[PDB]
Structure formats: C-alpha cells, structure tokens
Design a protein around this ligand. Sequence first.
Ligand SMILES: *[C@@H]1O[C@H](CO)[C@@H](O)[C@H](O)[C@H]1NC(C)=O
Ligand SMILES: [Ca+2]
Lengths: 243, 242, 49
Amino acid sequence: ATTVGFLSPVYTAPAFATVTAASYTISSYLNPVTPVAGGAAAVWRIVITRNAAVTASAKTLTCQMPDNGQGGSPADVTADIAVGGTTTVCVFSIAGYTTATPGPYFATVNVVDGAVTTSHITKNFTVLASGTTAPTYAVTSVVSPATPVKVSTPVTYTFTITRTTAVPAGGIPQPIICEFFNGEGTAPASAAAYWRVSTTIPDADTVVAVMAPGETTTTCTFTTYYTTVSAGGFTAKLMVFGE
Amino acid sequence: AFFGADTGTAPADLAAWLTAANGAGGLTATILPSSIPSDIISFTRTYAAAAASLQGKLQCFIGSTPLWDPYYPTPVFQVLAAAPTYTLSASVTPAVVPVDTATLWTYNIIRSVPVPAGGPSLPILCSFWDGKTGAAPTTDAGWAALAGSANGKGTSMAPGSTTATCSFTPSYSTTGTATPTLQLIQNSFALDAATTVGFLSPVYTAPAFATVTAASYTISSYLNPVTPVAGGAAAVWRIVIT
Amino acid sequence: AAAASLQGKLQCFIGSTPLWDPYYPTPVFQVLAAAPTYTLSASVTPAVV
Ligand SMILES: *[C@@H]1O[C@H](CO)[C@@H](O)[C@H](O)[C@H]1NC(C)=O
Ligand SMILES: [Ca+2]
C-alpha cells in the first residue's frame, strides 16, 4: 500500500512485437490401401499438427471432406487437441466405393480452427472391383541367436511382413507398427488388447515401419533379453497395427 | 475518352467511341513540340455498386485516328463497400542515442483489405516528423509536400499483400524526448498537393519516444618538452578534447 | 541537509541491557537535492513470434 512508483509514466517500448498466426501440417492416409467395392468400409485418418502448443484449453478443429474423389460428401469431423498437445486426428468413415470412375483417385481435406481454412491434397489411391479378395498380409519370424539360449542372453527377433499384392505404385505409404510380446510377461489378451501404451515409439516393444509405395515386403527387428528360466516355452508373439 | 465499369455498356462500335470522344465525354491532351509526354488528363466516375474487381477501357483519337486497335484496357481495379483501414506500428533499434547520431525509426503498416491481386501495386508516400525539429505540417497539403528530401519516402503495397515497411534516419541535435509522427498519402503519379487527402485523419504518432543524451567528451594531455627547465622554457600543455 | 554521504546511529535496549557496545551504525546514505530520473531502453531479440 505504502510503496511509491519510481517513474510517473508507465513505460512502453520504442518497438512492438508481431504475434503471427500458427500454421498447420496436415497428413492423411486411408487404412485399406486397396479397398474393394463394397467389400468393407474405409476409414480415412487425417492427422493435423499445430505450429505451437496450447495454453490451458483443448483446441477444437473441424475437418471437412467435400469430395471423395468419386462423388460424395459425408458429415464433417470434430477433433480436439490436448492442453499440452499439438496434434489431433479426424476420422472419415465411408464404404460406398465404386470403380465407375477410371482412376487413379485423390481427395482434398479442409481443416479449420479459427475459421482459417487450410486444405490438404491427398495422394493417389486405387480401388478394386466387386467380388475380388482384399489383399491380406503374411508374417514370418527368424531368430538370430537361435535356441537354446540362457537368461540375460541377447535374443534378436526379425519379423518379415509381406502383402499378397504390392502397394499401389501411384504413391501412398502404409504405416505399420510391430508390437511384440516376449512370452515372459503376464500373457496379454487378444490382439484388441495388444495395443498397450508406450512412452517413446521406437522402444523395445513397439516399432514403427513404413511400407513404401512400390514395395510389398518389409521387416521389423527387436533385440531383447530374457529374465527367467523356462524349458519348453517362451513363445514370441507378434501383432501389426496400421497407424 | 474513357469508360470504367460505371454506367451502361461499352460503345461496341469504333465510330461510337469517336462520337463519344468528340462530345462532352471527351477530353483533349496536348503534346508540345520536342516533348515526349502529354498533359495530365482527368476524368471522374461515380460508383453505386460494390464487390469484386473491374476493368475499364479507354479510346483516344488523333485526327480521327484511333490509338490501340479495339480500345486501351485500363488496369484491374476494385470498388469497395467500406473505406479500407490503415493501422501502423513503430520501432527503434537504437532506442537511446546521443546528440548528432543516426537513429533508425521504422514503421510497419497493415491494411484492412488486400491490394487487388490482378491490379498494380499501391504506392504511398509516408511523411515523418521526428518531433524535435520544426512545428511540422498540419494539413494534408503540408504532409504531401514532404517529398524525398530526407523527410518523406515512397513505399509500395505489393499486389495481394496487406503489409508495408518503411524507415527513416533522424539524427537529433538537442537532448531530451523526441516523439515522431507519420502520415500516409497515396503516392500516384498524379499526386496533387492542393486536393490531397490523407488516409489517417488522426495523424499516427508513435506511442513511444526517442531519447537524446548529452555528448560526452574524452580528453588527453601532452606537453612538448618532457623535461622542462626552470626559467628557460615555458611549459606548453596541449590538451586535446574529442 | 545536502552534500556528501552521511550516517546515523541506532541504539537498542532490553531492560536497560544495551545491544551493541557503542552503537549500531547505519549503512551509508546520501541526501539529494532533487528527485533523480531513470532512462530506460527496451529490446527484443525474437521480434517476430
Ligand atoms: C493421380 O491421378 C491422376 C489422374 O490420372 C494422375 O494424372 C496423377 O499423376 C496422379 N498423381 C500422381 C501420381 O502424381
Ligand atoms: Ca508398447
């Protein structure tokens, strides 16, 4: 109460500060790289990363998908970005794929936060005709040190993943994630429960790989140690999640 | 004569342009002997519409000879519903300077509406008064009279970009506080001083000021005979002050 | 007063028991003729953020 200001005029700098806008980085992919005409439903996943972080709120972004690349417009998607987070995801579920238009096909996705519209032009993709099978995947395993091993002995697993049909050459990558369960832990549940929570994505249990536009084969490599003795067991299990 | 997007339609016949120019809508220009340019021609057109850009056409006859084959299309221009708003901001990198020293006074300008994308740039003359010198101009005529003679300067809005940057270097002479002011006036080639009208009815003054500090001196002594004798030579102390 | 730096004396007691033997001298202070002013300059290294 009793303190007295040293300077009567409140100071203002001889210059200013320019607080610019925050840009946006949009990247999108379709989970089935080669969807069938009515064989299943395709769910486009559209990730968006902000320029900077948030301050005591959860940013609401809106995703417009006016064009399918073949004629159609489903409802928009509302997404939220955490208080400290910078990235968020929109999901667009459509199943009515037709091979009427010759192809190759592409889409455009608009993202708005403060009424500023930022468009993203999707890469090309292809759709099979009705009645044909969806190209599945196959996985084989090779262990480097080979059985029998001991406790705390280095053990390397290599999972070779192939697709029955090559990824379309028009250009779209497939982000796959190998999640490997050692056979030592608490025996996790079915694959729906295999998606555990990881701190850093290139860790000893989760690995992220990318299937290139023109390829059909890849591999994911783990190198782990073992802790307890077991005669006749320790079956290494694996799953792939496309994200 | 001329027709810019104002009333009716263009005279789709060349002789129609001829009879329009020969009447009241025409105007005469004189080119004197041994001279390249013509005198300034001025038309006035009222707009009751709004919205996007427009493109007019001129036609010009010398002894019924038509310059330019169909017409001369004028540059892209746009009519607006509301007057565009100019905002300003100011900076000094040498915030405190001594007397007789250069100081960098920078301004950034933001326009409400963008410069027409298909049209030309927007040239504007900025007139800057440091605040320590004379009483400065008060009217727009005086503001536009501040030409490039170390006091005014012409900058340009890029077509489609709503930003401007301008700079001046006032070197104050007297100590204390000097607050500058700045005025923006469209710097076209037909920029008149009698009928100039500024964009900023309140002449923007930088909220801060410039501080001028007294000039210090350095002083160094030396004397000619480093071992003087008593009564034989007079000591000469040469003192130098910078 | 005016001119050079000055000093004061502060002496305390508890039931006639004296704190500090002669006194406790105060820190050096100077009395001014007029209120001094402060000249301030400001800067930003990332002028655009
Ligand atoms: C996607 O499809 C269009 C239509 O034929 C094609 O012209 C274009 O080159 C493709 N996109 C690529 C691979 O750049
Ligand atoms: Ca994990």
